[PDB]
Design a protein around this ligand. Structure first.
Ligand SMILES: *[C@@H]1O[C@H](CO)[C@@H](O[C@@H]2O[C@H](CO)[C@@H](O)[C@H](O)[C@H]2NC(C)=O)[C@H](O)[C@H]1NC(C)=O
Ligand SMILES: *[C@@H]1O[C@H](CO)[C@@H](O[C@@H]2O[C@H](CO)[C@@H](O)[C@H](O)[C@H]2NC(C)=O)[C@H](O)[C@H]1NC(C)=O
Ligand SMILES: *[C@@H]1O[C@H](CO)[C@@H](O[C@@H]2O[C@H](CO)[C@@H](O)[C@H](O)[C@H]2NC(C)=O)[C@H](O)[C@H]1NC(C)=O
Ligand SMILES: *[C@@H]1O[C@H](CO)[C@@H](O[C@@H]2O[C@H](CO)[C@@H](O)[C@H](O)[C@H]2NC(C)=O)[C@H](O)[C@H]1NC(C)=O
Ligand SMILES: *[C@@H]1O[C@H](CO)[C@@H](O[C@@H]2O[C@H](CO)[C@@H](O)[C@H](O)[C@H]2NC(C)=O)[C@H](O)[C@H]1NC(C)=O
Ligand SMILES: *[C@@H]1O[C@H](CO)[C@@H](O[C@@H]2O[C@H](CO)[C@@H](O)[C@H](O)[C@H]2NC(C)=O)[C@H](O)[C@H]1NC(C)=O
Ligand SMILES: *[C@@H]1O[C@H](CO)[C@@H](O)[C@H](O)[C@H]1NC(C)=O
Ligand SMILES: *[C@@H]1O[C@H](CO)[C@@H](O)[C@H](O)[C@H]1NC(C)=O
Ligand SMILES: *[C@@H]1O[C@H](CO)[C@@H](O)[C@H](O)[C@H]1NC(C)=O
Ligand SMILES: *[C@@H]1O[C@H](CO)[C@@H](O)[C@H](O)[C@H]1NC(C)=O
Ligand SMILES: *[C@@H]1O[C@H](CO)[C@@H](O)[C@H](O)[C@H]1NC(C)=O
Ligand SMILES: *[C@@H]1O[C@H](CO)[C@@H](O)[C@H](O)[C@H]1NC(C)=O
Ligand SMILES: *[C@@H]1O[C@H](CO)[C@@H](O)[C@H](O)[C@H]1NC(C)=O
Ligand SMILES: *[C@@H]1O[C@H](CO)[C@@H](O)[C@H](O)[C@H]1NC(C)=O
Lengths: 206, 319, 326, 148
């Protein structure tokens, strides 16, 4: 993916290019006259005495100082942006690499399992390992099952019918279990639950 | 017509039209909040004229790149396609420009951003390439304008008696990239401003600490950049030896851990990353007092941190 | 156009300042691009666009105020229309004549509304919407049951009290329009963004009336009266002051842009953690125990409606750390 | 040639003969004036410079006179033939080369006789017997001083 996608690391390339341009731009501002007869101090001093030379020089000093000031100011602004990114990278190192995240779309796109850092010029690259569900099937469901006039709810997961029999399964992976008094809890008076269906809850003592 | 003018010595360049404004009995001209003259009284005919800038509102040129074709399209910002021949100045100055300013069948397309000429309109949707206006983008494959797509359409029917559950799964790996640090620079504020001029130096001392403040600001940044790196990579003080075994229960780590038997101290993936973002002016920079400083941590030290983080994860918890 | 206008003598002198002028244009261009990224990074969470259902009743839960009505002229929800009409809030000619313009956003308001409609529609009808590589259809009442378990409350509570819970939900949503209608300050944050930008542009235009030490604020009057040996001095004073005024404008836009980007990043995070999932973070997605959230479009920003579980009517009981049986 | 087509206007704006893919805002190299519209008031009479410059008698400096000039053309080239050469012709308000291109809302002529060495005192920010006791100009003086 990386070999065939030069843009994959575009973020790091942008940092390098922005800094290179700022320095070259700054150098090229020494060729400016800024209203003076010359961009070169030696040529001004060679031709003029102080009563006139100082005027021409002051124009060059002011413009060169403003150009340096604009460079420094934009570096401070950029530095703030990079520090914010560095803080985020540090957070990910702690929460994605040195632990498992419960935050959605923080350490990948699917369900986070683990991450590994890789070194790069001017930055860090994270490889996020995630669990992704596939091949979904639809089942008939119910909010509860009525055994003997008493409502039973699953401790975890959902009630599903496979076309003939009802089972308890987890939401993130189909793996149907038998409905027993251990997989459910008894609560409610049956006639108060909307969509409740009748079935048999297996008692393991029988 | 765009023209130069002089009314009682009051000069400028612009377009003269008829005004609907009223002047005081002894008013010769009017100006707005920017002190821009927008009205004058004609000295011989007692009539107020309006003055407009010859071009105003902004114009953009759209190109596929000069290494692809020489075709362009022109966007006239915030105008109708019926007024382009007037906002332009087609009969006065334009030559080859006439083909863009004048309408024709399939030459002009009206958008919210403005009037787009020279590009056709596809009447379909695609992913945005070159953004033009609000909802409108264009591609080379001349120039073709289209409405940008915001994703494919899907429909999930609602039901209250069924549920969808995955029966299979897969493991996927994605890549995320974050900047951590900048290039550290330093400026000699005397060499840059004055160079070898000693007369300038004496005059530069008249600006107080202004010069010093610039040096201090850059110094502060330079320090922060080393902190940025340390705060990301140096998560654990303990450095774990990279194992000779890259097989951890069938799981292959040989691409993310460094190979101790090779000349390189970096993993296969890391070497690839390094060779993709690597990407005399330098003499000019040095002569004018501009230099670049190295980072405190070398690349091998950064690699040592990442190797430790992975090695200590493949073999242990509570890391 | 801002610095020299129609003065060709000024133009020749402005070329003596190197790339200073170009740098200003580049900085503003960079900001303009970022602003479209800010919007995209918040609203375009899922590529799939889900058709808005004709049914607004999902197990007693009424969504008609947060989803758009396909039978009406409007493509926005009732709440969204209210938001839009509260932050809406010739100088324009003066701005254009002096080289100052405003560019439109890449995404129209209908496109933003399309994103929010998709996010809600795909939540009311399915789970695993953050991945959406395999969106999983689920009844809304069952999705709520899951969300209740997530806050430490047994799911039987929801089913037994489904009728009351649906009623409380429906009433709480209705109160949103009343709260916003009678509280103009509710969206003050978005109004501040609009006003700050409007002021900065008008302030910039009004700085062209300044003399900056010159005999005149008008270049044509200086050129009309003086020859170059003296005119250049008067002109240089105007060019320097006008350039400083443009530089201060651009600098403050860069600072403000950084603040907005930070806010956009937070909004994007909330979209992922509050809307496309359930948060475990205290006071991140509301004030109580987080169940679910819904986004609404607004001018220059996003509005979140956070649905939370709040306990009440507490009673005291005698307690013990353990029980000894035998 | 920056004025030929939209691609040249883009190349000139970016100062590059190579342009990358994308949309750019451009400078105006397209429209330029070719003529000029000059409009002046209906005045046919020349200013009565002869009245002051060729007068049979001038006042003393302690008792200088003032004359108002109006409804006339300020043609100063007539003084090349009909007047003595000026040893001093110094303008403070405007450049002397611009006088023929200007219109004034008011013009006043103040005239008197002084000795040669006192001519240098007829200016803003001066000291001396004349500057202090006889005739003084303001620091913000807009006008021209002529002497022969
Ligand atoms: C639905 O569930 C029933 C009960 O587990 C399945 O029926 C059993 O199928 C196995 C073969 O895999 C037989 O050996 C058992 O004797 C069957 N038991 C009963 C009571 O019939 C049934 O095959 C499942 N159907 C589907 C589509 O999953
Ligand atoms: C799921 O929805 C269906 C309707 O689409 C419900 O069935 C209806 O229930 C009402 C109320 O008892 C009856 O008046 C209708 O005649 C029923 N229609 C049909 C076709 O049966 C069903 O009860 C709902 N199930 C759950 C679990 O909520
Ligand atoms: C200035 O002089 C011009 C002549 O060049 C005057 O022009 C006259 O305009 C009126 C219309 O208002 C015509 O009816 C006359 O026939 C024109 N005169 C000539 C000789 O053609 C102009 O009106 C004068 N303006 C002022 C303020 O005096
Ligand atoms: C989930 O689906 C994948 C297919 O995408 C299954 O992987 C295949 O398993 C068969 C064995 O029955 C192998 O012959 C194929 O080569 C495997 N394909 C791939 C790409 O590895 C996987 O076994 C399924 N898992 C479960 C639990 O059903
Ligand atoms: C871990 O993966 C690497 C590849 O990244 C495996 O190395 C390859 O093994 C095959 C089979 O012997 C060789 O043909 C290739 O030339 C090897 N590639 C390289 C770069 O050496 C390695 O064997 C895998 N390890 C385990 C335990 O499966
Ligand atoms: C969802 O809520 C809306 C109100 O926001 C309900 O619409 C109202 O219904 C009452 C009773 O028929 C009417 O008197 C109102 O005029 C309706 N208001 C509007 C704006 O139409 C709607 O019926 C509710 N839907 C459900 C299923 O309860
Ligand atoms: C599952 O979906 C299919 C359509 O793909 C439908 O025909 C079938 O009836 C659904 N199953 C149930 C139990 O509704
Ligand atoms: C089974 O449940 C239904 C409600 O779905 C109820 O009407 C019926 O009486 C129940 N049967 C028995 C034996 O309880
Ligand atoms: C531009 O086109 C020339 C051929 O004229 C080619 O050699 C060069 O590599 C191309 N450059 C880019 C960036 O496509
Ligand atoms: C364009 O024309 C429409 C009328 O169809 C008018 O409402 C709008 O204001 C015009 N826009 C401009 C910039 O002239
Ligand atoms: C696209 O084509 C349809 C006709 O199928 C037409 O009604 C519509 O206006 C066209 N779009 C535009 C922007 O002209
Ligand atoms: C509960 O609080 C009340 C005061 O409101 C107190 O009188 C009562 O004794 C408390 N119950 C117990 C078990 O202490
Ligand atoms: C102007 O002054 C000269 C003397 O310097 C005199 O000879 C001449 O006649 C005067 N001109 C007129 C019209 O009186
Ligand atoms: C030149 O001056 C004489 C007076 O000595 C005058 O008569 C003559 O008309 C003047 N020439 C012109 C062109 O006015």
């Amino acid at each position: 993916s990386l070999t065939t996608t030069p843009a994959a690391l575009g973020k790091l390339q942008d940092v390098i290019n922005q800094n290179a341009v700022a320095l070259n731009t700054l150098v090229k501002q020494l060729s400016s006259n800024f209203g003076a007869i010359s961009s070169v101090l030696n040529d001004i001093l060679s031709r003029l005495d102080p009563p006139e030379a100082e005027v021409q020089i002051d124009r060059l000093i002011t413009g060169r100082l403003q150009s340096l000031q604009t460079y420094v100011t934009q570096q401070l602004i950029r530095a703030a942006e990079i520090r914010a990114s560095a803080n985020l990278a540090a957070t990910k190192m702690s929460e994605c690499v040195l632990g498992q995240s419960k935050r959605v779309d923080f350490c990948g796109k699917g369900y986070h399992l683990m991450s590994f850092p890789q070194a790069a010029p001017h930055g860090v690259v994270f490889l996020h390992v995630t669990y992704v569900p596939s091949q979904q099937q639809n089942f008939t469901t119910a909010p509860a099952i009525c055994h003997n006039g008493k409502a039973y709810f699953p401790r975890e997961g959902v009630f599903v019918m496979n076309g003939t029999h009802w089972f308890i399964t987890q939401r993130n992976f189909y793996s149907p279990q038998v409905i027993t008094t251990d997989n459910t809890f008894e609560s409610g008076s049956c006639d108060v639950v909307i969509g409740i269906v009748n079935n048999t809850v297996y008692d393991p003592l029988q | 017509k765009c023209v130069n003018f002089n009314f009682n010595g009051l000069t400028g360049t612009g377009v003269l039209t008829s005004s609907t404004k009223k002047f005081q009995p002894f008013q010769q001209f009017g100006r707005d909040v920017s002190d821009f003259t927008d009205s004058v009284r004609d000295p011989k005919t007692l009539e107020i004229l309006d003055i407009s800038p010859c071009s105003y509102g902004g114009v953009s040129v759209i190109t596929p790149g000069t290494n692809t074709s020489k075709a362009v399209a022109v966007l006239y910002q915030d105008v109708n396609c019926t007024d382009v021949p007037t906002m332009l100045h087609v009969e006065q100055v334009s030559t080859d420009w006439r083909v863009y300013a004048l309408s024709a069948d399939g030459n002009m397309f009206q958008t919210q951003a403005g009037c787009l000429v020279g590009a056709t309109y596809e009447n379909s949707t695609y992913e945005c390439d070159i953004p033009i206006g609000a909802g409108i983008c264009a591609k080379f494959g001349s120039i073709v304008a289209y409405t940008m797509s915001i994703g494919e359409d899907q429909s999930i029917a609602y039901s209250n008696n069924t549920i969808a559950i995955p029966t299979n799964f897969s493991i996927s790996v994605t890549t995320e990239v974050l900047p951590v640090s900048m290039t550290k620079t330093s400026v000699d504020c005397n060499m840059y401003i004055c160079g070898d001029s000693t007369e300038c130096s004496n005059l530069l001392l008249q600006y107080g600490s202004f010069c010093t403040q610039l040096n201090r600001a850059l110094s502060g940044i330079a320090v922060e950049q080393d902190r940025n790196t340390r705060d990301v990579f140096a998560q654990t003080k303990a450095i774990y030896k990279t194992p000779n075994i890259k097989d951890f229960g069938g799981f292959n780590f040989s691409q993310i851990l460094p190979d101790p038997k090779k000349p390189s101290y970096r993993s296969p993936i890391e070497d690839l990353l390094y060779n993709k973002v690597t990407l005399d002016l330098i003499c000019a920079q040095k002569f004018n007092g501009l230099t670049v400083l190295p980072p405190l941590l070398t690349d091998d030290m950064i690699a040592a941190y990442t190797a430790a983080l992975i090695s200590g994860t493949a073999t242990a918890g509570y890391t | 156009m801002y610095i020299c206008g129609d003065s060709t003598e000024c133009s020749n002198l402005l070329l003596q300042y190197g790339s200073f002028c170009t740098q200003l244009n580049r900085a503003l261009s960079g900001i303009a691009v970022e602003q479209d990224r800010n919007t995209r990074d918040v609203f375009a969470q899922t590529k799939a666009i889900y058709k808005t259902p004709n049914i607004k009743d999902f197990g007693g839960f009424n969504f008609s105020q947060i989803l758009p009505d396909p039978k009406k002229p409007s493509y926005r929800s009732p709440i969204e229309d209210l938001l839009y009409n509260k932050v809406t809030l010739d100088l324009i000619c003066a701005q254009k004549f002096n080289g100052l313009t405003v560019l439109p956003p890449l995404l129209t308001d209908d496109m933003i509304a399309a994103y929010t409609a998709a996010l809600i529609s795909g939540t009311a009808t399915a789970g695993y919407t953050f991945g959406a590589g395999a969106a999983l259809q689920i009844p809304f009442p069952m999705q709520m049951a899951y969300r209740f378990n997530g806050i430490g409350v047994t799911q039987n509570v929801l089913y037994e009290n489904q009728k009351q819970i649906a009623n409380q939900f429906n009433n709480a949503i209705s109160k949103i329009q009343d709260s916003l209608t009678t509280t103009p300050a509710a969206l003050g944050k978005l109004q501040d963004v609009i006003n700050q930008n409007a002021v900065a542009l008008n302030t910039l235009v009004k700085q062209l009336s300044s003399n900056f030490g010159a005999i005149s604020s008008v270049l044509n009057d200086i050129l009309s009266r003086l020859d170059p040996p003296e005119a250049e001095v008067q002109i240089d004073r105007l060019i320097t002051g006008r350039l400083q005024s443009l530089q201060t404008y651009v600098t403050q836009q860069l600072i403000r842009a950084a603040e907005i980007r930070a806010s956009a990043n937070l909004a994007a995070t909330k979209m992922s953690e509050c809307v496309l999932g359930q948060s475990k973070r205290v006071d991140f997605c509301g004030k109580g125990y987080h169940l679910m959230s819904f986004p609404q479009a607004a001018p220059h920003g996003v509005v979140f409606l956070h649905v939370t579980y709040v306990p009440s009517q507490q009673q005291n009981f005698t307690t013990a750390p353990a029980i000894c049986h035998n | 040639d920056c004025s030929q087509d939209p691609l040249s206007e883009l190349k000139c704006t970016t100062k590059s003969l190579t342009v990358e893919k994308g949309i750019y805002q451009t400078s105006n190299f397209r429209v330029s004036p070719s003529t000029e519209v000059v409009r002046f008031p209906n005045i046919t009479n020349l200013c009565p410079f002869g009245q002051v410059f060729n007068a049979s008698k001038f006042p003393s400096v302690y008792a200088w006179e003032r004359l108002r000039i109006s409804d006339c053309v300020a043609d100063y080239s007539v003084l090349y033939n009909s007047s003595s050469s000026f040893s001093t012709f110094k303008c403070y308000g405007v450049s002397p080369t611009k006088l023929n291109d200007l219109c004034f809302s008011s013009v006043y002529a103040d005239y008197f006789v002084v000795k040669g060495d006192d001519v240098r005192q007829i200016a803003p920010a001066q000291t001396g017997v004349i500057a202090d006791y006889n005739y003084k100009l303001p620091d913000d003086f807009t006008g021209c001083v002529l002497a022969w």
